[PDB]
Scaffold this active site. Structure first.
Site, PDB file in Angstrom:
ATOM      1  CB  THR A  14      -5.607   9.000   5.948  1.00 19.28           C
ATOM      2  OG1 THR A  14      -4.569   9.927   6.274  1.00 19.28           O
ATOM      3  CG2 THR A  14      -6.831   9.758   5.477  1.00 19.28           C
ATOM      4  CB  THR A  15      -9.962   5.875   8.340  1.00 22.37           C
ATOM      5  OG1 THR A  15      -8.901   5.186   9.001  1.00 22.37           O
ATOM      6  CG2 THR A  15     -11.056   4.904   7.966  1.00 22.37           C
TER       7      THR A  15
ATOM      8  N   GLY B 286      -6.480   3.280   6.234  1.00 17.38           N
ATOM      9  CA  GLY B 286      -7.466   2.595   7.084  1.00 17.38           C
ATOM     10  C   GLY B 286      -8.568   1.932   6.278  1.00 17.38           C
TER      11      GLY B 286
ATOM     12  CB  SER C 171      -6.546   5.971  10.883  1.00 18.37           C
ATOM     13  OG  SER C 171      -6.371   5.796   9.485  1.00 18.37           O
TER      14      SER C 171
END
Lengths: 228, 229
Positions: free
Chosen positions: B1-2, B131, B170
């Site tokens: 996840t970013t 991320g 991500s």
């Protein structure tokens, strides 16, 4: 009588008779001849066949040690194959451990160190063969000769065996700055045909190998068409 | 996840990748981690999708009730403070890196990182998720504050792309949303039009010389790519 029974013993004159006697085995062996050119190196060896009924490629005296390098054995072939087997072990340690094709100068010193080891100890005997190491690694085309003593020396050209003396006379007629591998295959084979005893050793062939720019710096037997 | 949120003058840009992953398999390829709380206050959700969705829905509902009863717009500070209380109360039970960001006419564009502890830090820009770690050096080097709305969106997209190029966790679409005095502009960059990926970067075209044909030389040439050669 006891001065010459084992190789662990110097004589009074300062020499190692068992190593000289191993040398005698090479000088009574089939003639080998080799030439180091700009293009690469060439090895030609006369194989004296005992029988009419051998296959072509029987008792090959010339063996690939690595891609770039090959040993031609003048002397006792079995002993020679122990050196080939070691030269291989060293060539594959160079690639396994140091990620490099073993250099000719290195491979030769390694072959000589091995052959010498067998001249120092009562329990072993000297090898009965001179190895001719031909290589075309990063140190360029190199031709070396380890003898039974372990003595390595680099050569432009070299003759070993019972016609050593006469084959050398003919190698001195060649200019080594000038000649190519393609000429040499011709001249070296021609030399071995000339020096050969026709009445003593009726059955024989001339095994030629090279490692040159032509062959992709790969140590191979030359095709049968070039050989004469 | 970013997830990231930068401030420009009028307002803010939230940006996020689109991948939820069960470790090494992409469960969702097109998640929307930019989650509405009010008209002009969004959060970006990192960590347990379950936990952040649950918080984002709880906080959105409190903010809606609040907005109805005060009969005025909600301040981003309010959204951030509610989200902090919930992310703090449950800090042991949930895994939830939040970025609350939005516009209010009092304070303009505001960004709040509420990381895993339940800290609430008011920032010019915030990074979040697996991320985030790739971007801190990217921002330090390339981020210049006082960007245009357009430049911030381009930059935020370029950022998210740089993160999701290196973070396995991500990937996918880059969702942005600009929150300012004007109507919110969401946009979704598909991966095939991303501003950066390693696959298209000419730096990484020439392959590592790992394979290497069996040669009579220590000279490294190239990879062996044919059995004949």
């Amino acid at each position: 009588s006891g001065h010459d029974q084992s190789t662990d013993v110097f004589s009074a004159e300062g020499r190692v008779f068992q190593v000289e006697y191993a040398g005698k085995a090479v000088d009574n062996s089939s003639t080998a001849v080799a030439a180091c050119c700009k293009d690469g190196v060439v090895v030609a060896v006369e194989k004296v066949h005992t029988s009419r009924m051998l296959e072509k490629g029987s008792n090959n005296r010339i063996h690939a040690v690595d891609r770039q390098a090959g040993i031609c054995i003048c002397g006792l072939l079995p002993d020679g194959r122990a050196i080939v087997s070691r030269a291989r072990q060293e060539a594959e340690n160079s690639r396994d451990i140091f990620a490099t094709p073993i250099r000719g100068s290195v491979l030769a010193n390694r072959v000589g160190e091995f052959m010498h080891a067998y001249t120092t100890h009562f329990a072993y005997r000297p090898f009965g063969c001179s190895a001719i190491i031909a290589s075309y690694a990063d140190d360029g085309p190199q031709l070396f000769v380890s003898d039974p003593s372990g003595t390595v020396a680099g050569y432009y050209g070299v003759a070993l065996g019972k016609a050593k003396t006469v084959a050398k006379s003919e190698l001195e007629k060649l200019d080594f700055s000038s000649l190519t591998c393609d000429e040499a295959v011709g001249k070296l084979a021609s030399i071995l045909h000339e020096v050969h005893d026709k009445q003593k050793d009726k059955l024989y062939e001339v095994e030629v190998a090279w490692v040159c720019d032509k062959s992709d710096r790969k140590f191979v037997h030359v095709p049968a068409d070039m050989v004469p | 996840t970013t997830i990231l949120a930068v401030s420009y003058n009028g307002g803010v840009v939230l940006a996020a990748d689109s991948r939820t992953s069960s470790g090494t398999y992409v469960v969702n390829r097109a998640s929307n981690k930019l989650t509405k709380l009010t008209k002009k206050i969004y959060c970006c959700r990192s960590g347990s999708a379950a936990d952040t969705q649950a918080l984002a829905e709880r906080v959105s509902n409190y903010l809606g009730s609040y907005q109805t009863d005060i009969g005025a717009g909600v301040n981003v500070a309010t959204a951030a403070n509610l989200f902090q209380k919930m992310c703090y109360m449950n800090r042991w039970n949930i895994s939830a890196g939040i970025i609350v960001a939005g516009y209010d006419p009092i304070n303009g564009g505001s960004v709040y990182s509420i990381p895993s502890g339940g800290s609430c830090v008011k920032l010019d820009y915030a990074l979040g998720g697996s991320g985030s770690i790739f971007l801190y050096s990217f921002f330090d080097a390339n981020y210049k504050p006082g960007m245009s709305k357009s430049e911030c969106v381009a930059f935020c997209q370029r950022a998210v792309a740089h993160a999701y190029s290196r973070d396995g966790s991500s990937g996918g679409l880059i969702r942005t949303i600009t929150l300012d005095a004007d109507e919110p502009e969401d946009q979704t960059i598909p991966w095939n039009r991303s501003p950066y990926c390693m696959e298209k970067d000419p730096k990484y075209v020439t392959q590592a010389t790992q394979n290497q044909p069996f040669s009579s030389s220590a000279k490294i040439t190239g990879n062996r790519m044919s059995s004949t050669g």
